[PDB]
């Protein structure tokens, strides 16, 4: 149930348009984002942010 969006690295943060709208942007938690964009998916096991 994973999701798709980006992250930035300057905001070290992952957005992405959740399965409903209702999740949104997400600290990159552990190795922050890579560049601005940077593809990444939120785990709907546990609310990591896979960036």
Same mark, same amino acid.
Do not use: H, L, M
């Given at each position: 149930?994973? /999701? @798709?969006? !980006? *992250? /930035? !690295?300057?905001? @070290?943060? *992952? !957005? /992405?348009?959740?399965?409903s709208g209702k999740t949104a942007i997400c600290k990159c938690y552990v190795k922050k984002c890579p560049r601005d964009g940077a593809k990444c998916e939120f785990d709907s096991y546990k609310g990591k942010c896979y960036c």
């Amino acid at each position: 149930a994973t /999701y @798709n969006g !980006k *992250c /930035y !690295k300057k905001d @070290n943060i *992952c !957005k /992405y348009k959740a399965q409903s709208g209702k999740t949104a942007i997400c600290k990159c938690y552990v190795k922050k984002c890579p560049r601005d964009g940077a593809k990444c998916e939120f785990d709907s096991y546990k609310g990591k942010c896979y960036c």
